[PDB]
């Protein structure tokens, strides 16, 4: 009797806690990427910059 | 849900997987870009350091 | 032991979503619990309850539904005086037990 009428409700329920957080996981990876972009900008070349600064 | 439901379940979670994979791959690009810009600016710093030291001598 | 009973075709593996409850349904309640298993929980396949193997007073039977559906399905099952047995399928130990009894008969003679 349920047929596919309730199956669409089931799909809507799942797509709330799977699809949404798949996009938000991509976005969390974006945010972590920007964070570690800053950290990479400030850890490796920064240490080498300090090395050459002491060389200077 | 025997055939239409669970197949859609699988397809939606598949799409989630490729999007997260693309996010990791684009992390790879963004980290390479971080390195590129980082070496660019320290190279610039090296350039003016060398020039001002030449002036100092 | 349900070693001679559970079959892969009705026992859903290789699917993180679906999973087969090997419900025990009395013959006197043959059509009954088959019908009521439709609406014990959501995320369900309607009326997939089908006979696997017939015993004298009851019979094992397969119902296909989502994994977290099993929790609500079993809860409302226990509410209505229903029986659900989760006999997990794995072919190799059934083969091993059959060879064990064979080799013990050989050791006996």
Short characterization:
This is part of a larger assembly, with chains A (56 residues), B (57 residues) and C (109 residues). Chain A is mostly helical and 56 residues long. Helix content of chain A is 89%, strand content 0%.
Overview of this structure, please?
This is part of a larger assembly, with chains A (56 residues), B (57 residues) and C (109 residues). Chain A is mainly α. Chain A is built from 2 helices and no strands. The longest helix of chain A has 37 residues. Chain B is rod-shaped, with a radius of gyration of 25 Å. Chain B is built from 1 helix and no strands. Chain B is mainly α and 57 residues long. Chain C is α+β, with helices and mostly antiparallel strands and 109 residues long. The longest helix of chain C has 18 residues. Chain C is globular, with a radius of gyration of 16 Å. In chain C, 24% of the residues are buried. Chains B and C meet through helix 1 of B and loops of C.
What is the element layout, followed by pairings?
The structure is cut from a larger assembly and holds chains A (56 residues), B (57 residues) and C (109 residues).
Chain A: H1 5-17, H2 19-55
Chain B: H1 4-56
Chain C: E1 18-26, H1 30-36, E2 50-54, E3 58-66, H2 69-79, E4 83-85, H3 91-108
Antiparallel strand pairs in C: 1-3, 1-4, 2-3
Key attributes of the depicted protein:
part of a larger assembly; 3 chains; B: 57 residues; mainly alpha; 1 helix; C: 109 residues; alpha+beta; 4-stranded antiparallel sheet; 3 helices; 4 strands; 24% strand; membrane protein; V-ATPase; synaptic vesicle
Distance between the termini of chain A: 82 Å
Largest sheet of chain A: none
- Give me the number of helical elements of chain B: 1
SSE arrangement of chain B, N to C: H
Could you tell me how far the N terminus lies from the C terminus of chain B, measured between alpha carbons in angstroms?
A: 82 Å
How do the SSEs of chain A run, as a string of H and E?
A: HH
The secondary structure category of chain A is mainly alpha
- DSSP summary, beta strand count of chain B: 0
Total beta strands of chain A? 0
């Amino acid at each position: 009797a349920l047929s596919d009428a309730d199956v669409q409700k089931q799909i809507k329920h799942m797509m709330a806690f799977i699809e949404q957080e798949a996009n938000e996981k991509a976005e969390e990876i974006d945010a972590k990427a920007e964070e570690e972009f800053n950290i990479e900008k400030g850890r490796l070349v920064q240490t080498q910059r300090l090395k050459i600064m002491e060389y200077y | 849900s025997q055939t239409q439901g669970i197949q859609q379940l699988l397809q939606a979670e598949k799409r989630a997987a490729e999007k997260v994979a693309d996010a990791r791959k684009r992390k790879a690009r963004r980290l390479k870009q971080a390195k590129e810009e980082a070496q660019m600016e320290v190279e610039q710093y090296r350039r003016e350091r060398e020039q001002e030291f030449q002036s100092k001598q | 032991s349900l070693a001679e009973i559970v079959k892969k075709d009705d026992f859903v593996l290789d699917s993180e979503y679906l999973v087969t409850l090997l419900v025990v349904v009395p013959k006197l309640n043959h059509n009954d619990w088959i019908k009521q298993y439709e609406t014990l929980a959501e995320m369900v396949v309607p009326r997939s309850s089908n006979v696997l193997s017939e015993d004298q007073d009851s019979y094992l039977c397969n119902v296909t539904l989502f994994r977290k559906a099993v929790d609500d399905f079993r809860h409302k099952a226990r509410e209505n005086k229903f029986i659900v047995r989760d006999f997990q399928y794995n072919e190799e130990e059934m083969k091993a037990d059959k060879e064990e009894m064979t080799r013990l008969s050989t050791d006996k003679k």
